[PDB]
Design a protein around this ligand. Structure first.
Ligand SMILES: [Mn+2]
Ligand SMILES: [Mn+2]
Ligand code: NA
Length: 611
């Protein structure tokens, strides 16, 4: 160089730019030149670093220590920055059709495309100088067990220590990742809260964000994730949704594998047999509940591999092998109780960061549906930092409030949850919240029918909406092409295609009362699936697929469960259902709907027409 402007060595407060692989230095230094951070901190992922970072956030008023627990912390956000924001989440490709099918109605529910030229303008209006007066943290992270053949590495730059702490929990991060990477490829992840110093606008609740300029972008062809303006969860912790679902699903398409919005659990029966199952559910359908369920059936065990995301690839033997690419759980707090999720309660009592929950007088946590009384004298501070009484109209915790907790701490974490080869998936479960019409459990008639069942997924938001594969907000590319990708798995010689099931825990009677007790009782449905995978003759054929035979389900210990209503299938309901599915698929998928999905649709309408 001719002057002193391109070498950022003098500003490195941890690590060394010289030590980084060539491409990692270029990524760091080039974005330092653009964002103008005061300091550069190359994260080592050590306990020392983590402790120091947390104490600093505490010293700044960014987080509070929760004194009741072992090393637990609370962040309360600006009320404007409280969730993943779909409307400001976009994917950039040369052609719109590579990102979303072109809808007949003109508005796609299946993603949000932005042109390269539009994004460049948006980028230029946000990032130049954005980290002025702040530290740029460099987070080297692995998605998946370090050195799993299914693992992928990222480098996230961020000006938020909250993101650093949370990424330590949610990914494998630090020096060993940099050493594992070498000169290999990595996903480029750029994040800024968008508040350069001196601050141009008021800081609310010591929580830096820029709501008006919030934009979460994915550029799969450039292997880049670029996120600006939000410090919250899926917007800022770039490994989780942006990388592990959006970028990864496109990589999966390119490379022959699957990046899915699925829990992974291992279930052991009383005959000492173990099987792994994956499950894709939409929001508020008991996903974490199922992943760390304690079964009510004696002699059965459930163990948790992951509660959110699965990366799956068929091996040389034809087994569908899955890994959890995450290193922790980022769960919705409200509704987490000893009765709904006792294992979550045990997990989150130490080494956990909470966001937007209430705090009790003795330094504990509180939220709606915690179902745990407080001793007289103990008072509650809401997530809005105000004194709170259960007589108030507003909740003590934000509905989207979170815990962020180490996976290793789950008392029923699966012994193979970090196995680099992954676990063999023998069943895949789709499901949604449906008050009417949809039986407790059915089984797809074939792989193609199963792909159709995923494609047709609907769930009560009240309004029933489509969430195919529970991937609606997360498709990395054209949904029609994603369906074709799924269907292509049947044409792999020797592929062992898992059995596909659909579940509905949420069927109500004519009064609005749930017909199924759920929770640990769901083990009875898992038992049925287990037997079906073993080839048990325990099914009855219906127009929608296989259901449990009369007396096939274990209902002992339950009272009088209304099986007729729970498993009832109405021609009138399913006529309406199939018509709605048809209209949705025609509109939203159009020219990109695979022939086999059109065929399954026709086949279902025909079976229904014959009842
Ligand atoms: Mn999720
Ligand atoms: Mn085919
Ligand atoms: Na705060």
């Amino acid at each position: 160089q001719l002057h002193n402007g391109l070498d950022f060595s003098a500003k490195v407060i941890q690590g060394s730019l010289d030590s980084l692989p060539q491409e990692v230095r270029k990524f760091v230094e080039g974005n330092a030149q653009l964002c103008q951070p005061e300091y550069i901190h190359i994260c080592d992922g050590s306990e020392e670093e983590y402790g120091r970072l947390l104490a600093h956030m505490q010293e700044e008023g960014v987080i509070r220590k929760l004194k009741k627990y072992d090393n637990c912390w609370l962040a309360l956000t600006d009320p404007r920055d409280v969730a993943r924001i779909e409307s400001k989440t976009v994917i950039i490709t040369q052609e719109q059709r590579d990102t979303v099918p072109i809808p007949k109605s003109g508005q796609s529910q299946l993603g949000r495309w932005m042109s390269e030229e539009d994004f460049e303008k948006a980028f230029n209006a946000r990032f130049p100088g954005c980290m002025k007066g702040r530290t740029m943290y460099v987070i080297p992270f692995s998605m998946g067990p370090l050195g799993s053949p299914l693992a992928k590495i990222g480098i996230e730059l961020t000006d938020s220590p909250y993101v650093v702490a949370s990424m330590r929990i949610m990914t494998r991060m630090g020096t060993s990742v940099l050493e594992a990477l070498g000169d290999g490829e990595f996903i480029k992840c750029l994040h800024s809260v968008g508040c350069p110093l001196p601050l141009k606008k008021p800081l609310v609740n010591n929580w830096a964000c820029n709501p008006e300029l919030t934009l979460i972008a994915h550029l799969p062809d450039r292997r880049e994730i670029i996120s600006f303006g939000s410090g919250y969860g899926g917007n800022s912790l770039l490994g989780k949704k942006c990388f592990a679902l959006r970028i990864a699903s496109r990589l999966a398409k390119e490379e022959g594998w699957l990046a899915e919005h699925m829990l992974i659990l291992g279930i052991t029966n009383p005959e000492g047999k173990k099987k792994y199952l994956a499950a894709a559910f939409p929001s508020a359908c008991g996903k974490t509940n199922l992943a760390m369920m304690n079964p009510t059936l004696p002699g059965w065990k459930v163990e948790c591999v992951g509660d959110d995301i699965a990366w799956m690839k068929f091996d040389a033997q034809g087994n569908l092998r899955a890994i959890n690419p995450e290193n922790g759980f980022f769960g919705v707090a409200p509704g987490t109780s000893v009765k709904t999720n006792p294992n979550a309660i045990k997990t989150i009592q130490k080494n956990t960061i909470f966001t937007n929950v209430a705090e009790t007088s003795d330094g504990g946590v509180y939220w709606e549906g915690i179902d745990e009384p407080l001793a007289p004298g103990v008072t509650i501070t809401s997530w809005k930092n105000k004194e709170w009484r259960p007589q108030d109209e507003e909740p003590c915790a934000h509905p989207n409030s979170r815990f962020c907790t180490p996976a290793s701490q789950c008392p029923i974490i699966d012994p193979a949850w970090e196995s680099p080869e992954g676990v063999p998936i023998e069943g895949i479960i789709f499901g949604g919240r449906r008050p009417a019409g949809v039986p407790l459990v059915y089984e797809a008639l074939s792989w193609q029918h199963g792909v159709f069942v995923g494609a047709a997924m609907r769930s009560e938001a009240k309004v029933i909406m489509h969430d195919p594969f529970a991937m609606r907000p997360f498709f990395g590319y054209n949904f029609g092409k994603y369906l074709a990708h799924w269907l292509s798995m049947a044409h792999r010689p020797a592929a062992k295609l898992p059995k596909i099931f659909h579940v509905n825990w949420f069927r109500k009677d004519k009064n609005g009362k749930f017909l199924w007790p759920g929770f640990g009782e769901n083990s009875r449905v898992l038992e049925w699936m287990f037997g079906r995978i073993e080839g048990e003759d325990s099914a009855k054929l219906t127009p929608i697929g296989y259901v449990p035979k009369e007396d096939a389900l274990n209902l002992k210990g339950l009272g009088d469960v209304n099986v007729e209503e729970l498993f009832g299938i109405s021609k009138e309901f399913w006529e309406k259902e199939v018509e709605e599915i048809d209209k949705y698929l025609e509109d939203q998928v159009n020219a990109d709907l695979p022939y086999e999905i059109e065929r399954e649709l026709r086949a279902l309408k025909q079976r229904i027409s014959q009842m």
